[PDB]
Amino acid sequence: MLKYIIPTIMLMPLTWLSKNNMIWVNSTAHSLLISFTSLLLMNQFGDNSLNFSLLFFSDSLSTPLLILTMWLLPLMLMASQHHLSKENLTRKKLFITMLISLQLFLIMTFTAMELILFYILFEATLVPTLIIITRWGNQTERLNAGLYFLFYTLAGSLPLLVALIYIQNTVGSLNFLMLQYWVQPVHNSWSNVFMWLACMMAFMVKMPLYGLHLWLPKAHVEAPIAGSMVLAAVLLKLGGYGMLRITLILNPMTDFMAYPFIMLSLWGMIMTSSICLRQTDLKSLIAYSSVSHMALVIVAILIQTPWSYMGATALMIAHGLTSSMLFCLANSNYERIHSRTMILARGLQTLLPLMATWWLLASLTNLALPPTINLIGELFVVMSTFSWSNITIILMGVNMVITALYSLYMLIMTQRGKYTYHINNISPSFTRENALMSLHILPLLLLTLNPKIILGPLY
Amino acid sequence: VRDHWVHVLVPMGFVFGYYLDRKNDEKLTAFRNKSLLYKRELKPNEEVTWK
Amino acid sequence: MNPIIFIIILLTIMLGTIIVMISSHWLLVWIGFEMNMLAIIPIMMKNHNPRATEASTKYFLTQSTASMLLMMAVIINLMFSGQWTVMKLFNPMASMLMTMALAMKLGMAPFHFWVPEVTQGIPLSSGLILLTWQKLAPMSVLYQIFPSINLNLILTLSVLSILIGGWGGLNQTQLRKIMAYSSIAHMGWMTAVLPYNPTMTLLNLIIYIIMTSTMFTMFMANSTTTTLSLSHTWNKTPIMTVLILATLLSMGGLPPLSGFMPKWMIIQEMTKNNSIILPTFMAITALLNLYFYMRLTYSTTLTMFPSTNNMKMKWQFPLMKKMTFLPTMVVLSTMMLPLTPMLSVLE
Amino acid sequence: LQYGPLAYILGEKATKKMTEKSKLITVDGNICSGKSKLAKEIAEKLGLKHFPEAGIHYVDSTTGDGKPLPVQFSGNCSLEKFYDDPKSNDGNSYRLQAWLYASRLLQYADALEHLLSTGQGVVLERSIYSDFVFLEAMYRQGFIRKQCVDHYNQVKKVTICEYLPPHVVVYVDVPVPEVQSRIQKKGNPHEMKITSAYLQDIENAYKGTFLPEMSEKCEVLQYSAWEAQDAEKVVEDIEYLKYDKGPWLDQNDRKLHKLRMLVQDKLEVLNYTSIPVFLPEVTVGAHQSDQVFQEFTELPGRKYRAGYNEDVGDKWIWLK
Amino acid sequence: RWQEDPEPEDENLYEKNPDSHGYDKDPAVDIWNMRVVFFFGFSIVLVLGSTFVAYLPDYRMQEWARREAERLVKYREAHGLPIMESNCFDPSKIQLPE
Amino acid sequence: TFQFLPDEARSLPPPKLTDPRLAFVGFLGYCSGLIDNAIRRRPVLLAGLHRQLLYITSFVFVGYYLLKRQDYMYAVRDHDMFSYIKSHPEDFPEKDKKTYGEVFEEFHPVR
Amino acid sequence: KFYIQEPPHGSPNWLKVGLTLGTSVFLWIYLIKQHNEDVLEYKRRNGL
Amino acid sequence: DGPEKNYERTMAILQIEAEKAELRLKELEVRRLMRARGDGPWFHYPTIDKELIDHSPKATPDN
Ligand SMILES: CCCCCCCCCCCCO[C@@H]1O[C@H](CO)[C@@H](O[C@H]2O[C@H](CO)[C@@H](O)[C@H](O)[C@H]2O)[C@H](O)[C@H]1O
Ligand SMILES: CCCCCCCCCCCCO[C@@H]1O[C@H](CO)[C@@H](O[C@H]2O[C@H](CO)[C@@H](O)[C@H](O)[C@H]2O)[C@H](O)[C@H]1O
Ligand SMILES: CCCCCCCCCCCCO[C@@H]1O[C@H](CO)[C@@H](O[C@H]2O[C@H](CO)[C@@H](O)[C@H](O)[C@H]2O)[C@H](O)[C@H]1O
Ligand SMILES: CCCCCCCCCCCCO[C@@H]1O[C@H](CO)[C@@H](O[C@H]2O[C@H](CO)[C@@H](O)[C@H](O)[C@H]2O)[C@H](O)[C@H]1O
Ligand SMILES: Nc1nc2c(ncn2[C@@H]2O[C@H](COP(=O)(O)OP(=O)(O)OP(=O)(O)O)[C@@H](O)[C@H]2O)c(=O)[nH]1
Ligand SMILES: [Mg+2]
């Protein structure tokens, strides 16, 4: 992975040694080049994973997440450079440095072979993320959002640290390849119940599981755009990726320990989907949409079937691009009217025709129109949960109806109807904004032509 | 050029990273041509099966 | 103080500590504490004010009481073993008395009350010595007598200090009191692991000293003793706020920073001994410290507090304080995690 | 050797350099009292260093190239505005007074540092000891609020206690009707708007509080407008003083080493002039202070520590 | 109250530069910023990256498996063998308990 | 006794001067040099190159010996462990290993 | 002569610069010789 | 990389990790025995040194 770690590190001297007026041009260009080289991780085999060294390996799960991570960095620089224009040069470079350091931690997190190494990098991503929200967030409540984000994570991740160290004492290793062969079944006992909870709760809080999700709508409403993009696109998936790995060593206890969390997710997705119908803040609505989509991923991971694991992987990639798009679309309205209230600016299709097309395409992927990878992932999960229990189709089906209602409600309210009379500063869409939208949707829709590369190891 | 010398930092980081990844392989050759699946005889001019 | 006298008094503080660390005889250990306590009082008093006199007196009474209890343990040990060798004690009552005496000297809860008051009442440089160098001599005795220490007593002292230190710091706006309660909590980690692996005690002590020295040095560079005063740093030395932010996050135990290392290794050693409830309770309780470290970062670096007009006059003059070793200390305080296996040098 | 404990240990002790001519002299009086001319004559005749009264731009004169900086870098304090609009809602009146006290505190530190490092005495025009007469006058005319006075006394309490008082206080006693006569003659348009009541309050503070206080600890010499023209007689009075009071008699090399360590560190001198007391007159919002600070760093020779500015011709930076 | 700067007015980039791409105020920097994004984003990563994915050599051995399955089905049916057996592993290699 | 590197440590190979850990120690020394420039408001990258060089050299010099002790202490740990295992064969019996054909594991269906 | 007062670091402290560079040079020679003597002692003790 | 290189590189990784895991388990077992029995170089707490003892004839005989 050094071929990706080192050029990612080199982005920092590049940004600090650039001409004052070329920091965005240089950092954007070269992080796109890094993104290009990340397609070499597609050398995946039918049986064995791509095992680079003692520290890092890649397989069909981490590879799509790695490519999404490295693609998002140039998109985040594009999205941020406008609202940061007044910021002084040194603080602009510090912002870019936090984004670069976040990518470095993420690519190491997704390829770490040893689980304790994964833990440290999994935890390291908090620091830059918290700095981005609290330092460059706009409103007073970013400080509270920083605290809720920090302490929800640590409340769960500290027990995970104890469990992981305990496993290494008992098994002798935390290398994931070793655990694949030395895994022993988890017997029933109260000690093992709490070992299971310690191994899972940290990832649940990040997903987030319904009931532990209240930190996420806060974080989004306060974060700058780049913070929201990385939060929705990648940082939520640290939980899913972690769960997909650690469930290896929790069998067969997961058979019954998953029940409370399947109930929370199955009922949670309908609650959060219903909540979206009444949200008044556009960022908050998109945030609640994420909780509903990720509730599907939790269920898929917990029932552990080949179809559910393939659907979970596709959903994680598909949601990453869609939710990042939706935040970017909402932000482009914010940069004009400086309010997140959904009902403030209406009938924008009359004033911004092409931006309304991006709004339509994003909404259609959010409601999972076939054959988008959003639908492929959701469908594979629905198929597998039907076998788990036929009654789940009723809950899955109801959520599909509610998802369409709130996705189109968001499109109708902001883009259709009559424009607001007094809002007279809706200037035409910039080339930057249009390019940013298309750099989300185009790879998303292109993936429909070759979905296998985002279906994960079980493919 | 003093204008465009910063543009080699990341490309050279990739070349250095690529090179160090190959160096890493030289330390993991304990089973080169020794696995039951792929073990074979060397070709007349072959020194090693892979590097 | 005359500069030569100040040097000789500083060297006597160090010499008293060194005597404790090189002695094999219990009397010499006691002498080292006596000499060390005699030499430290003048630097608590050096600014001559009622607050510094109260702190010096409160400090004297605590340390003198602890030294009397220590000499009792030594004499009881002599009665029941006929020897003075510094090692395990040979009588459980002697062990409790020495453990309690050393807990009092370290300011561990529930013998902690003097630490916030004495630190508040003395200059920053004196507080720096009080909360770092002065921990060396008592910890080095605990390093040698730990086989005979009552496990329940030491772990109770540790748990109380982590709770008291964590809760006490939540209510503080004075930087010296924040450091005092932070010190109390960190002592608890050091003694909790001592029965299992004293090496990890040394690791925690060394790293704690490094981060504590960094913070005190950064406070001294700007002459800041209160939260609100520290909140003016952004409008004077912006680099300092970034260093303070990084160091505080390290003292919070956040990966990938150096301060994660001692908590990480202590949890490992305790789990190897099938201690699971205690390390988990300690780690969760240490979130209290992270909270009031984070509060300082909000008011120092991550937000810009209101300034004063006279601050503009400060823009025209450079920092002239020594800030000795600060660039090295801050880098060690934050960037040492990749070198964690180096802890074996302490074995 | 830059001064410090090492220099002190090696024999750089104040009592060596200081003679019976190593005296700090301050000249005080009301506005237009002629103290400026008397101060220069005293300094010339006794061979002392003269410090012109510290104004709004005193600190600029001691740093950089020595030239005054734009007004936004002093907070937009304006003595002219004070006369035009002493009751302005923008708080200019006290912001000026707080700034002027800090300027005088800095100058007093410079004067003591000169005295302790060279042994040559100094002559000052007003000081941090007499600065309060203007604040009392301001308060009594209703130009500043009571909370401004409380803030002023806090800053003075924790700053003036560190320094020694002048050896000699020279007061020039010009009555208010004469002062107003000299103000109109001077013909400064803004100054003529001064009220005799403001001038009478300045005199009341001087004679009610200042002179009685300094008499306990200094040598206080008083002259009228006529007696102040005879500079030789004033200098004759100074040279015949006994110096039998004050804390300058208690000083010794040890105490003067601590004092010199303080006055040479200007940031330590000004430490308490910015105590976090959020008085509206002196509080600056974060956005403004941030913007002004970035502008200051862009001024010539101000980005880096003195001697490290390539834009003003500093050399050998890679070996410094 | 205090001395604070007023909120600045939001500036429309199109006023000074009607050709603005929305990247930078400097027209020369603005155009270059547009060019790297469009060239490295669309011409390189998306076009060449899509082409690269389209020609991945038998990703995860799906094509080899189909060829191998055809070979086994041919050989097994020629020799009258079951196409597939319930037992993944040879029973003679397994020692059951009791 | 009270020795940083006892004489028996000389039988071990020295750390290479290109050790990745030693390079990181050197990088930490470089970072300290820049932070020194920053806190004193000098040009961060150019100011005092003589000082920047000694920061790197000092870190590397001390780092080299600390790495040497680190490796020696782990060699001693392995030496002690293996000797103790030889001295007490009864506590470390050579395990009787069965194949998975003979070992019975319960099957837990995921249905 | 831009500065009204002479800066404390107007010109380099040549003695300090000589000490600094001399210390760096000495430390490298000592380290290099130490490494060589370590490599030879290692080879002797192990017979290589 | 060809599949053979990755396959055999994987084996080299597995061998190193498996050997480390066994050593980790043995160390925990060795430490447990040394601490309980005191017969090893670890957990060797000092006892008084017998070279401090004076063996010469004393002022009185019975000792
Ligand atoms: C032996 C240990 C020391 C190793 C040191 C190795 C690197 C030494 C670099 C010395 C030259 C540094 O160069 C110094 O810093 C930067 C980058 O050049 C320059 O200033 C910079 O300003 C801005 C960025 O802030 C940009 O326009 C551009 O990067 C550059 O002009 C200074 O004008 C120059 O004086
Ligand atoms: C279950 C696993 C995760 C559990 C995580 C729970 C740990 C605590 C997380 C939040 C910590 C925030 O710490 C503190 O919380 C309170 C509210 O809770 C905040 O306070 C906020 O809510 C309170 C109560 O309504 C209000 O009085 C206050 O005006 C408001 O600002 C504080 O400003 C914040 O400093
Ligand atoms: C494999 C690595 C790929 C990396 C790709 C990186 C793309 C970077 C795009 C850089 C954009 C060009 O950057 C800019 O180009 C012109 C011409 O060369 C330079 O030179 C310019 O200077 C002045 C303008 O003030 C004029 O003479 C003229 O416009 C031009 O010559 C600029 O000084 C430089 O800032
Ligand atoms: C905090 C109080 C401060 C004031 C302290 C007052 C002085 C205390 C004097 C303690 C000296 C007595 O100490 C005590 O003596 C008795 C006499 O055999 C010892 O012996 C006692 O317990 C052990 C248990 O195995 C056995 O010897 C026996 O059961 C019993 O006689 C105790 O092990 C020892 O703890
Ligand atoms: N508000 C305020 N004004 C001050 C202060 N010190 C000086 N000034 C003003 O600065 C101006 C000049 O002061 P003076 O020295 O007394 O007048 P001068 O005629 O130039 O000098 P003399 O002839 O000696 O009297 C006057 O308008 C003073 O009111 C002060 O501390 N506060
Ligand atoms: Mg005058």
- Describe the main β-sheet of chain G briefly: none
Bound molecules: dodecyl-beta-D-maltoside, guanosine-5'-triphosphate, magnesium ion
Helix/strand structural class of chain F? mainly alpha
**First-last Cα distance of chain G:** 66 Å
Order of helices and strands of chain G: H
Beta-strand percent range of chain G: under 5%
What is the approximate shape of chain G?
Answer: rod-shaped
In terms of structural class, how would the helical and strand content of chain G be classed? mainly alpha
Helix content of chain G: 55-70%
Order of H and E elements of chain F = HH
Oligomer status: part of a larger assembly
Q: Tell me the number of strands of chain G.
A: 0
PDB class: oxidoreductase
Keywords: Complex I, oxidoreductase
Entry title: Bovine complex I in the presence of IM1761092, deactive class iii (Composite map)
Chain A: NADH-ubiquinone oxidoreductase chain 4
Helix-strand blueprint:
This is part of a larger assembly, with 8 protein chains of 8 kinds.
Chain B (H helix, E strand, L loop, with lengths): L8 H18 L25
Chain E lengths: L12 H4 L10 H28 L7 H17 L20
Chain G lengths: L13 H33 L2
The complex binds dodecyl-beta-D-maltoside (4 copies), guanosine-5'-triphosphate and magnesium ion.
One dodecyl-beta-D-maltoside (LMT) sits at the interface of chains F and A.
Structure description:
This is part of a larger assembly, with 8 protein chains of 8 kinds. Chain B is mainly alpha-helical and 51 residues long. Helices cover 35% and strands 0% of the residues of chain B. Chain B has one domain (2-51). Chain B contains 1 helix and no strands. Chain B starts with 8 loop residues before the first helix and ends in a 25-residue tail after the last helix. Chain C has 17 helices and 1 strand. Chain C is 71% helix and 1% strand. Chain C is an all-alpha fold and 347 residues long. With 320 residues, chain D is of the alpha/beta class. In chain F, 26% of the residues are buried. Chain F has helices at residues 20-39, 49-87. Chain A binds chain E through residues 21-22, 24-25, 28-29, 32-33, 35-36, 39, 42, 44-47, 60, 71, 74, 78, 81-82, 85-86, 338, 425, 427-428, 430-433, 435, 439, 442-443, 446, 450, 452-453, 459, and chain E through 8, 10, 12-14, 20-26, 29, 32-34, 36-38, 40-42, 44-46, 48-50, 52-54, 56, 59-62, 64-65. Strand 1 of chain C pairs antiparallel with strand 6 of chain D, so a sheet runs across the interface. Bound molecules: dodecyl-beta-D-maltoside (4 copies), guanosine-5'-triphosphate and magnesium ion. One dodecyl-beta-D-maltoside binds next to loops of chain B. Magnesium ion binds at residues 36, 53 of chain D.
